[PDB]
Amino acid sequence: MNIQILQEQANTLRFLSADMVQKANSGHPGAPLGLADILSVLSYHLKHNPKNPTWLNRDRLVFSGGHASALLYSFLHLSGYDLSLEDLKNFRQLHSKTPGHPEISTLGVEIATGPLGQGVANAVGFAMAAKKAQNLLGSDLIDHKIYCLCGDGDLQEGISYEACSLAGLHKLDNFILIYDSNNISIEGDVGLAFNENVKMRFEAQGFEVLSINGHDYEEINKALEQAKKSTKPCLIIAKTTIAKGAGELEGSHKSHGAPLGEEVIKKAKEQAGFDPNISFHIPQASKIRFESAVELGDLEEAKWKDKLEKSAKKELLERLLNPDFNKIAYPDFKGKDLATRDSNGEILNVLAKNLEGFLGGSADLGPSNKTELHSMGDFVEGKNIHFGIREHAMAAINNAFARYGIFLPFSATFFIFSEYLKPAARIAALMKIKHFFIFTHDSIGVGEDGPTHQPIEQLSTFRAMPNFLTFRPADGVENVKAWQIALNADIPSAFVLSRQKLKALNEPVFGDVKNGAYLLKESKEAKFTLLASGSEVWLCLESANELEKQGFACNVVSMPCFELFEKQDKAYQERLLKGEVIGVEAAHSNELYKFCHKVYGIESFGESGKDKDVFERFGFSVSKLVNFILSK
Amino acid sequence: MNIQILQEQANTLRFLSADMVQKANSGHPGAPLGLADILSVLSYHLKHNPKNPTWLNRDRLVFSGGHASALLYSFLHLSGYDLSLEDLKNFRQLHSKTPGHPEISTLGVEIATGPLGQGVANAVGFAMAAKKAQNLLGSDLIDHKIYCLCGDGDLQEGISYEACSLAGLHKLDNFILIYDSNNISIEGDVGLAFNENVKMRFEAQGFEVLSINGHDYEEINKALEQAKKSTKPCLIIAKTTIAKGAGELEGSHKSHGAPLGEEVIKKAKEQAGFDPNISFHIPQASKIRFESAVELGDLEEAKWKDKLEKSAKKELLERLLNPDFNKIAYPDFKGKDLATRDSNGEILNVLAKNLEGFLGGSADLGPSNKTELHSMGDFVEGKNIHFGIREHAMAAINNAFARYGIFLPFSATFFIFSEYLKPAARIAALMKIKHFFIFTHDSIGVGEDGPTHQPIEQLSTFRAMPNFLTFRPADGVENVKAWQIALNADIPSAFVLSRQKLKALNEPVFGDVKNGAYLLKESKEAKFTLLASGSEVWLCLESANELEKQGFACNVVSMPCFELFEKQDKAYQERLLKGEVIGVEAAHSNELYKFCHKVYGIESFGESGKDKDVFERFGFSVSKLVNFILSK
Ligand SMILES: Cc1ncc(C[n+]2csc(CCOP(=O)(O)OP(=O)(O)O)c2C)c(N)n1
Ligand SMILES: Cc1ncc(C[n+]2csc(CCOP(=O)(O)OP(=O)(O)O)c2C)c(N)n1
Ligand SMILES: O=P(O)(O)OC[C@H]1O[C@@H](O)[C@H](O)[C@@H]1O
Ligand SMILES: O=P(O)(O)OC[C@H]1O[C@@H](O)[C@H](O)[C@@H]1O
Ligand SMILES: [Mg+2]
Ligand SMILES: [Mg+2]
């Protein structure tokens, strides 16, 4: 560890990054060049095993500025991860292992980033998760750091403030945040849009704040040493020059987001002592020094595995890693009228009791979402997490809990406020992680709180989002079966739950919840089929009885999950969907036309009133639905 | 102005609020009771005309904690606004003027609130708008204050930090923020989730911070006096007790969100000297004192109208209030191949030149969204607003610009990051305000930036949202006609625009953009109709040519706006939608089943690659679409 080696290392990172962007004719060279000195030093402090990216006590590295991907990829390649030089040469190309922003399918990537702010919140979540894992497994087994690299953009996003608020409160002295302060964004000087006293901001949230030149190797190293000893979450404010090393592009906003150009790279390499007529060159000293992570990480993991073998907590870790969902005895809600917020809250309690790694909480709405895990304590000693009024950061935090390696997290709020966390929900879908979203107060049934609190379009959004199951159970029994699917599935799920009491259903006649839709009533030569979800299923059962009394044979279909029904074969769908099919939902859900000839929905916003008054106003009554179905 | 009158006034506000909640058996009495002393004093400082809620230079009052509605309504009633005592007795009832959270259809309500955080951001926007209005009209005509009441919940939301960041940067010394610091939220003690040094936080963002007892009338009054003289945006941290005055419920979380109960109200009234056996009682001194706002506000407005008549800026104000959209000469893009981000950016420039009140900006993406208004300067002297990486606050800010009274605002970002601002977009829809959303980079056509940057489900979301037009123009000409509709419509619109170059269309054969969908190609006895929007329309024109060469008559339908097409009559829809109708869109857009027998979409997330490689991978090619249409 000396200046000549660190300089060559940093420059190696620079020109791999620069050459990658240039070959793709696409990407972001500025931030890589600006961060290259920092990551060169950080490589000496990071504890990780390139050959086992799943090692539980590794330091977690997050690039919150995901546009800096070329740098990450360079570093994973150089350090010994399963990413090749040829992979680097296919940066940004279809089906490569080096996509434009980082994805977890590339080994070594902790969490997908790209949407700004998420990664900072993810890093706080990894730090919380680590403090919980320490609670469960002991500080002999869990003691690692969480390093996050962020930029101007990340810190302007609300979610950064939310998550850092929580990091201060919980005294996350395992969290180190490195701010790339280069005074440049896409619109140019960051002073056009931002002039906070960042040090004072973070100290207000309980951080220790260090301030460095991010191109001075000794200063970087001294800050990391001091940060690792902090009794607070720690922010390093690293002053850097965007595209450091790229001559005429140093400090230029034009370097943020477009290739540096062949002649600029040629000059840069000349000034650093690199041959300008070759690309993707790794000098020898740098190569050996970066790849020494392989031997060192192997040894650190072995030393840890020895501590595990002596630990009283081996059996526990194996249950966390291998949860048994099939043994769980769920509540039996058959014939019980209940609001599905209530059935779901009982289910949450059963899961928390059966699964040592199942935990979560609400965004200040525990008592209304019914998500309190009774007698299970408050984080960190217990399982209930009090996220505050921070839906977005809650979801990003729990995305990281779900990636940590031993946790099954849930996030809760009113379904209307799913919109505040939707970007993080999307990253859960993109990753295909097991993170459960609990959304109560699902419709105009909310009543008096009025239109700003009554979901209309949210079901469409979550249904349209790929890799994401949206369950809307009609009763407790459907709510159970939904959980059983959710825990076994390979993608995240949301639970869309009522404020108001719903009526228990009769048993399936054909199919079940696992088919997405199923028959509750089946009639030979059916003229109509009424298809509904959640709170609208009883309206449909009643309306079908009235239709039958009038001489019209009817099928009634419960559809607790649209996405699962889409996956059913033709023969199944044909048996359910007979005659003229009418879909009925307290939502604006045009997607139902995929399965329905007519849709009886809500096309406007809601109203403030008693639930029974609002449902009647919006047409959710037997007499009105039967008149629609009979077209008169 | 003395203690006995202020106490009676505050208690009048308390018991109207409490009695309203009790009669509804629904609502939030805690915050009203806690804020009642503050608003009693604030009533002496507020400049407003109850009989003309549109007076341009009124002080703007925002209740960011919209759950405190009962208090607002009590105050509007008492002050002389067109809200009656009978209206108060129908709190939270279907079709009343006193819905559970405030709505702009109730005169005197500045902006709809309810979703926490929005109002604080709205208040910053009203303060920016006021600084712009001052730039245009002079400080002789615009000099008012913006008062915002907020709670714990508002300040935990990210959007509060975003908006206050901007308030500091822009030195909004017309903005006064009153924080109801009662240490209680729904989950109880706020310390469970939040322990920031709030003073230090705000000072880091450029605020002056005062700290008071919010039940001491002289302290409240002295803070307001000092706040009105601040050279900074100012925060008053007002320590209050939730449900102050309600005995056993003082300081209780149970008072947040449920009626206080008849016996608690009886005691409260006894202790305050009010008769406990009557409800909705306004004592005489309080009545006369509150309603004096009528005479005083009339006089303040008259004095202002005199200043207007002497002003050089009368003609300008009349053009701002009465924009003439029909005279605008738009660019003629007929036959020109362009990315619609580019056509739209030319249109933005034309509008900014023709409309003195048209302004806006991007969330750090001006150069990529193509929204820079060239040669028009930077806010406040000019029209370009640099919002930073703050999509959510941008939208909430611009919602307030749209309510200020003289502005036509636009908000811009990548369509994928519409998800960060969607809750504010919703409030624009709920209010039916003229606020324009510019969303570029609309699909997998984005290419290399990959799946976190490629919209899939966002079209469904915006289509499903009521009162919101979603235009996805196929070329420059469609982009123009979309703007022409948008400016004349009574609801907000989004523009969904491409990164990549699109091909100019031939002229409509039947119908036009104003019908939402229209024919580009019409064939007698058509066997198929290919229906598309935006970038997919040329794929459809080409595929229809290939189908015709194979012997199949085809109609091609461009659908730049789904919502407008939904409103067309039967006869129009029937002429367009002939034979088997196939919808084609680079989105997961199941809503198309409303108009299409088959849908050829994207059902997964995207991929990082060259645009032509990704489109081919996802099946957007003539050969693949023709093979689907011919089912083989
Ligand atoms: C939520 C969000 N909004 C917008 C963007 C678009 N975007 C990509 S990088 C960037 C700004 C980069 O600023 P900074 O973090 O200062 O990066 P640097 O210029 O220093 O590379 C933006 C706005 C994004 N990725 N995420
Ligand atoms: C964005 C958002 N999330 C959640 C809620 C639900 N909600 C209503 S009031 C409230 C908390 C109230 O806390 P505070 O502002 O401290 O109000 P107080 O208890 O002092 O009345 C919440 C979480 C909401 N209205 N908006
Ligand atoms: O009866 P629930 O819906 O559980 O309570 C509704 C809550 O939602 C918000 O309006 C209030 O904050 C209130 O506490
Ligand atoms: O060519 P465009 O799409 O305009 O630039 C793309 C931008 O989007 C982000 O990935 C980068 O920040 C880059 O500048
Ligand atoms: Mg920067
Ligand atoms: Mg509070």
Is A187's CB within 8 Å of B156's CB?
no
Q: Which residues of B516-531 are buried (b: 16+ CB within 10 A; e: fewer)?
A: bbbbbbbbeebebbbb
A184-185 and B188-189 as β-strands: parallel, antiparallel, unpaired?
Answer: unpaired
Answer whether A421's CB lies under 8 Å from A413's CB: yes
Among residues A292, A318, A344, which one ends one of the domains?
A318
Grouping H, G, I as helix, E, B as strand and the rest as coil, residue B580 is strand
The residue type of B522 is E
Q: Whole-angstrom Cα distance, residue B411 to residue B390?
A: 11
- B590: closest CA among A422, A567, A592, A496? A592
Residue B14 main-chain phi, psi, to 5 deg? -55, -50
Residues after which chain B is discontinuous, using a C–N cutoff of 2.5 Å: none
Q: Whole-angstrom Cα distance, residue A123 to residue A625?
A: 50
Q: Pick from A92, A466, A590: which is nearest to B464 by CB?
A: A590
Residues after which chain A is discontinuous, using a C–N cutoff of 2.5 Å: none
Tell whether B584 and B485 lie within a shared domain: no
Cβ neighbours, 10 Å, residue B183: 15
Provide the token pair at B526.
């058509």
Element housing A57 (H / E): none
Q: Is the CB of A153 under 6 A from ligand 1?
A: yes
Q: Whole-angstrom Cα distance, residue B18 to residue A411?
A: 33
- Mutation to test the A interface, candidates B197, B209, B449, B613, most A Cβ within 10 Å: B449
Q: Whole-angstrom Cα distance, residue A250 to residue A246?
A: 6
How many DSSP H helices and E strands does chain B contain?
A: 23, 18
Reported for A50-54, long-range contacts at CB under 8 A and 24+ positions apart, including other chains, are A50/A76, A50/A79, A50/A80, A50/A81, A50/A108, A50/A293, A50/A294, A50/A297, A51/A80, A51/A294, A51/A297, A51/A298, A52/A297, A52/A301, A53/A81, A53/A107, A53/A108, A54/A405
Q: What pairs with residue B359 in β-bridges?
A: B409
Answer whether B561's CB lies under 8 Å from B588's CB: no
Q: Whole-angstrom Cα distance, residue B173 to residue B241?
A: 29
Grouping H, G, I as helix, E, B as strand and the rest as coil, residue B87 is helix
- A493: closest CA among A429, A431, A427, A406? A429
Provide the token pair at B82.
């067109």
- A355: closest CA among A400, A410, A428, A437? A410
Among residues A284, A318, A352, which one ends one of the domains?
A318
Tell whether A346 and A277 lie within a shared domain: no
- Residue recorded with tokens 């060049």: A33
Q: Is A453 annotated as a binding residue?
A: yes
Provide the token pair at A386.
């009090």
Q: Is A144 annotated as a binding residue?
A: no
Answer whether B135's CB lies under 8 Å from B107's CB: no
Q: Is the CB of A426 under 6 A from ligand 1?
A: no
Tell whether B265 and B406 lie within a shared domain: no
Q: Whose CA is nearest to atom 1 of ligand 4?
A: B368
Provide the token pair at A437.
């979203």
Eight-class DSSP state of A419: G
Tell whether B482 and B585 lie within a shared domain: no
Q: How far is CA B45 from the centre of its chain?
A: 28
Cβ neighbours, 10 Å, residue B263: 11
> Taking the C-alpha atoms of B318, B322, B326 and B330 in order, what is their torsion angle to the nearest 10 degrees?
70
- A532: closest CA among A414, A439, A625? A625
Answer whether B308's CB lies under 8 Å from B56's CB: no
Element housing A412 (H / E): strand A408-414
Answer whether B208's CB lies under 8 Å from B265's CB: no
Please check whether residue A612 touches B, CB under 8 A.
no
Answer whether B607's CB lies under 8 Å from B444's CB: yes
Query: Is the backbone peptide bond immediately before A537 cis, with ω within 30 degrees of 0?
Result: no
Grouping H, G, I as helix, E, B as strand and the rest as coil, residue A551 is coil
Answer whether B109's CB lies under 8 Å from B48's CB: no
Tell whether A459 and A487 lie within a shared domain: yes
Residues 6+ apart with CB under 8 A from B625: B530, B539, B540, B543, B584, B600, B619
Q: Give the angle B367-B370-B375 at the CA atoms, nearest 5°.
A: 85
Tell whether A131 and A36 lie within a shared domain: yes
CA of B182 to the centre of ligand 6 (A): 5
Q: Whole-angstrom Cα distance, residue B400 to residue B413?
A: 18
Q: What is the largest CA-CA distance in chain B?
A: 90
Q: What DSSP letter does each residue of B426-491 carry, written as one string?
A: HHHHHHT---EEEEE--SGGG-TT-GGGS-SSHHHHHHHSTT-EEE--SSHHHHHHHHHHHHHSSS
Please check whether residue A334 touches B, CB under 8 A.
no
Provide the token pair at B165.
């960041």
B208-213 and B234-239 as β-strands: parallel, antiparallel, unpaired?
Answer: parallel
Please check whether residue A94 touches B, CB under 8 A.
yes
Q: Is the CB of A115 under 6 A from ligand 1?
A: yes
Structural domain of A494: 319-514
Residues 6+ apart with CB under 8 A from A257: A27, A28, A30, A67, A186, B368
Q: How far is CA B4 from the centre of its chain?
A: 41
Answer whether B364's CB lies under 8 Å from B385's CB: no
- A452: closest CA among B489, B423, B492, B365? B423
Grouping H, G, I as helix, E, B as strand and the rest as coil, residue B278 is coil
Reported for B96-99, long-range contacts at CB under 8 A and 24+ positions apart, including other chains, are B96/A608, B98/B20, B98/B69, B98/B73, B99/A450, B99/A451, B99/A607, B99/A608, B99/B69
Q: What pairs with residue A181 in β-bridges?
A: A239
Cβ neighbours, 10 Å, residue A85: 11
Tell whether B99 and B247 lie within a shared domain: yes
Is A204's CB within 8 Å of B206's CB?
no
Q: Whole-angstrom Cα distance, residue B103 to residue B115?
A: 12
Answer whether B181's CB lies under 8 Å from B240's CB: yes
Which ligand is in closest contact with the Cα of B256? 2
Pick the catalytic residue from A391, A536, A563, A591: A391
Eight-class DSSP state of B233: -
Residue of A nearest to B94 (CA): A609
Q: Is the dihedral of CA A204, A206, A207, A209 positive or negative?
A: positive
Query: Is the backbone peptide bond immediately before B124 cis, with ω within 30 degrees of 0?
Result: no
- A493: closest CA among A532, A578, A435, A407? A435
Q: Whole-angstrom Cα distance, residue B422 to residue A254?
A: 30
Tell whether B173 and B184 lie within a shared domain: yes
Q: What pairs with residue A556 in β-bridges?
A: A521, A530
Residues 6+ apart with CB under 8 A from B377: B383, B384
SS3 assignment for A459-510: HHHHHHCCCCEEECCCCHHHHHHHHHHHHHCCCCEEEECCCCCECCCCCCCE
Residues for chain A: how many in total? 632
Provide the token pair at B569.
């009559």
Provide the token pair at B176.
């006064």
Eight-class DSSP state of A591: G
Residue A29 main-chain phi, psi, to 5 deg? -90, -15
Q: Whole-angstrom Cα distance, residue B443 to residue B614?
A: 10
Tell whether B531 and B492 lie within a shared domain: no
As annotated, the active-site residues of B are: 391
Provide the token pair at A365.
């709405």
The residue type of A233 is P
Grouping H, G, I as helix, E, B as strand and the rest as coil, residue A307 is helix
Alpha carbons within 13 angstroms on the beta-carbon side of residue B350 total 17
Residues for chain B: how many in total? 632
The residue type of B426 is R
Q: Give the angle A205-A365-A201 at the CA atoms, nearest 5°.
A: 10
Q: What DSSP letter does each residue of B483-530 carry, written as one string?
A: HHHHHHSSS-EEEE--SS-BPPPPPPSB--GGGSSEEEE--TT-SEEE
- For A104-204, where are the E strands, in sequence order? 146-150, 175-181, 184-185, 188-189
Cβ neighbours, 10 Å, residue B54: 9
Residue B599 main-chain phi, psi, to 5 deg? -130, 130
Residue B234 main-chain phi, psi, to 5 deg? -120, 135
Q: Whole-angstrom Cα distance, residue B24 to residue A402?
A: 43
Residue of B nearest to A198 (CA): B204
Is B466's CB within 8 Å of A605's CB?
yes
Q: Whole-angstrom Cα distance, residue B372 to residue B364?
A: 11
User: Strand B436-440's sheet: what is its strand order?
Assistant: B384-386, B358-362, B408-414, B436-440, B493-496, B469-471
Residues 6+ apart with CB under 8 A from B284: none
Q: How far is CA A375 from the centre of its chain?
A: 28
Please check whether residue B233 touches A, CB under 8 A.
no
Q: From which experimental method does this structure derive?
A: X-ray
Q: Whole-angstrom Cα distance, residue A451 to residue A453?
A: 5
- Residue recorded with tokens 């002039």: A195
Q: What DSSP letter does each residue of B534-570 carry, written as one string?
A: GGGHHHHHHHHHHHHHTT--EEEEE-SBHHHHHTS-H
A188-189 and A184-185 as β-strands: parallel, antiparallel, unpaired?
Answer: antiparallel
Per CB-CB distance under 8 Å, the chain B contacts of A168 are 195-196
- For A220-267, where are the E strands, in sequence order? 234-239
- B177: closest CA among B58, B84, B42? B42
Provide the token pair at A326.
């099939």
Tell whether A314 and A359 lie within a shared domain: no
Q: How far is CA A468 from CA A327, A434, A459, B457, in A?
A: 25, 10, 12, 12
Q: Which residues of A537-565 are buried (b: 16+ CB within 10 A; e: fewer)?
A: bbbbbbbbebbeeeebbbbbbbbbbbbbb
Is B466's CB within 8 Å of A588's CB?
yes
Q: How far is CA A448 from CA A338, A409, B65, B86, B323, in A?
A: 20, 31, 16, 18, 38
Element housing A248 (H / E): none
Q: How many domains does chain A have?
A: 3
Please check whether residue B152 touches A, CB under 8 A.
yes
Answer whether A70's CB lies under 8 Å from A12's CB: no
- A598: closest CA among A580, A574, A623? A580
B469-471 and B518-521 as β-strands: parallel, antiparallel, unpaired?
Answer: unpaired
Q: Whole-angstrom Cα distance, residue B591 to residue B580?
A: 17
Residues 15-74 of A with CB under 8 A from B: 24, 26-27, 66
- For A161-270, where are the E strands, in sequence order? 175-181, 184-185, 188-189, 208-213, 234-239
Grouping H, G, I as helix, E, B as strand and the rest as coil, residue A187 is coil
Per CB-CB distance under 8 Å, the chain A contacts of B417 are 115, 423
Tell whether B236 and B100 lie within a shared domain: yes
B528-532 and B580-584 as β-strands: parallel, antiparallel, unpaired?
Answer: parallel
- B297: closest CA among B80, B582, B83? B80
Tell me the nearest-neighbour CA distance from B430 into chain A, angstroms: 7
- For residue A368, the domain's CATH number is 3.40.50.970
Cβ neighbours, 10 Å, residue B322: 7
Cβ neighbours, 10 Å, residue A142: 21
- B459: closest CA among B401, B499, B418? B418
CA of A10 to the centre of ligand 2 (A): 48
B188-189 and B208-213 as β-strands: parallel, antiparallel, unpaired?
Answer: unpaired
Please check whether residue B103 touches A, CB under 8 A.
yes
Q: Whose CA is nearest to atom 12 of ligand 4?
A: A257
Cβ neighbours, 10 Å, residue A377: 10
Tell whether A434 and A529 lie within a shared domain: no
Q: Is the dihedral of CA A241, A244, A250, A254 positive or negative?
A: negative
Provide the token pair at A586.
């307290």
Residues 6+ apart with CB under 8 A from A87: A73, A77, A96, A97, A98
A469-471 and A518-521 as β-strands: parallel, antiparallel, unpaired?
Answer: unpaired
- A548: closest CA among A540, A537, A557? A540
Q: Whole-angstrom Cα distance, residue B57 to residue B59?
A: 7
Burial (CB < 10 A; 0-12, 13-18, 19+), residue B533, is: buried
Residue of A nearest to B456 (CA): A465
Among residues A318, A334, A350, which one ends one of the domains?
A318
